[PDB]
Each structure stands twice: as structure tokens, then as C-alpha cells.
Amino acid sequence: AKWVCKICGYIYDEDAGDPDNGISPGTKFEELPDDWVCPICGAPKSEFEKLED
Ligand SMILES: [Fe+3]
């Protein structure tokens, strides 16, 4: 699934993970660390919204 950072527009794609920041591919948004932030603007996880209907 994909989740968008409502602050900058970054898209956390579970399939891609965030390797740069210690998150391998396939890591579900809910399994990210409570301390994980957007790699682009630093917004907390709370500012992400899943892309679903
Ligand atoms: Fe962001």
C-alpha cells in the first residue's frame, strides 16, 4: 500500500520501503518505527494518509 505525507507530498510506498533510512522493501507503514519520519520533510508518521478509497 502507499501512504502520502500530507506535509510535502512524499509517498511512502510499502513495496519500496525507505532503505536510506534503515527501512527495507516490503515494510508496512504500521511496522515503521514510532520514531520514523518522512525522509523528505521530517514530518511524523501522524501526518501520513493511506491512499485508498
Ligand atoms: Fe514529508
Curated annotation (Swiss-Prot):
Cofactor: binding comment: Binds 1 Fe(3+) ion per subunit.
GO biological-process terms attached to the record: alkane catabolic process
Disulphide-bonded residues: none
Cofactor or coenzyme needed: Fe(3+)
Recorded GO MF terms: electron transfer activity; iron ion binding
The Rubredoxin-like domain, residue ranges: 1-51
Chain residues that bind Fe cation: 5, 8, 38, 41
UniProt-listed PROSITE patterns: RUBREDOXIN (PS00202), RUBREDOXIN_LIKE (PS50903)
Temperature dependence: Extremely thermostable, being unaffected after incubation for 24 hours at 95 degrees Celsius.
Any single Pfam family the record assigns to this protein: Rubredoxin
Keywords of the record: Electron transport, Iron, Metal-binding, Transport
Record function comment: Rubredoxin is a small nonheme, iron protein lacking acid-labile sulfide. Its single Fe, chelated to 4 Cys, functions as an electron acceptor and may also stabilize the conformation of the molecule.
Annotated family: Belongs to the rubredoxin family.
NCBIfam families tied to this protein: RubredRD
Name of this protein: Rubredoxin
